[PDB]
Write an enzyme that holds these catalytic residues in place. Structure first.
Site: not given
Length: 218
Positions: A177, A128, A111
């Site tokens: 991501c 994020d 992540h």
């Protein structure tokens, strides 16, 4: 705007390099293989190498700005300040001379997220593109990054910084991501609102690929 559209020749260069039955180097200024390069192909999770390339690019293209690779935060969190005590010196500047410090974070080797230390606005931000909301890991990141600033500055700044969660465009899939971090880094580097879209994100893959193939770090 910030993420340009490639022309036909430039994009075809990316295509050909992606199809490439592959070698060692595409770059070495950070060593990039075609294997690492292939992580910029569509639907592919970006690796640390590629993120490192982009952070370097940002440094070179942004005055008074440090953008560490992903290993910075690993060392900071696992070894404390003492583990990263020389990292700033290697940047040829002092923390008090900076506008911002970017710290890409690879949580659980999967992540990708982003820390932004803004020395002028006196904030430390957690960004994020797969946000559940404030959680334990984000709180620890913010804590650690403040601790860094406090230490690196020989205790002259950081103690009074705002520790915030920065809203950003959210990704529509589970693999972009790496790219969203790059975009947050670019936009943040330009003091632009984080109001890019998923279409922008697709262009970013081709952009970074282009930057690698053109040896953009000169």
């Amino acid at each position: 705007s910030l993420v340009p559209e490639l022309n036909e020749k430039d994009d075809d260069q990316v295509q050909k390099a992606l199809a490439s039955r592959e070698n060692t180097q595409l770059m070495n200024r950070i060593e990039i293989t075609v294997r690492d390069f292939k992580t910029l192909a569509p639907r592919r999770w970006l690796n640390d190498t590629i993120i490192e390339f982009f952070m370097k690019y940002i440094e070179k293209s942004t005055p008074n700005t440090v953008a560490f690779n992903s290993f910075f935060y690993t060392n900071l969190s696992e070894r404390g300040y003492q583990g990263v005590r020389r990292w700033m010196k290697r940047k040829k500047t002092q923390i008090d001379k900076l506008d911002k410090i970017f710290t890409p974070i690879n949580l659980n080797q999967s992540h990708w997220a982003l820390g932004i230390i803004d020395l002028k606005k006196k904030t430390i931000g957690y960004v994020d593109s797969l946000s559940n909301g404030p959680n334990a890991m984000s709180f620890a990141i913010l804590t650690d990054l403040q601790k860094y600033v406090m230490e690196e500055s020989k205790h002259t700044i950081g103690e009074d910084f705002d520790l915030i969660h920065l809203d950003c465009p959210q990704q529509p899939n589970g693999y972009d991501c790496g790219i969203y971090v790059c975009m947050n880094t670019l936009y943040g580097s330009a003091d632009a609102p984080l109001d890019f879209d998923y279409k922008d994100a697709i262009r970013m893959r081709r952009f970074i690929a282009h930057l690698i193939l053109t040896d953009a770090l000169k």
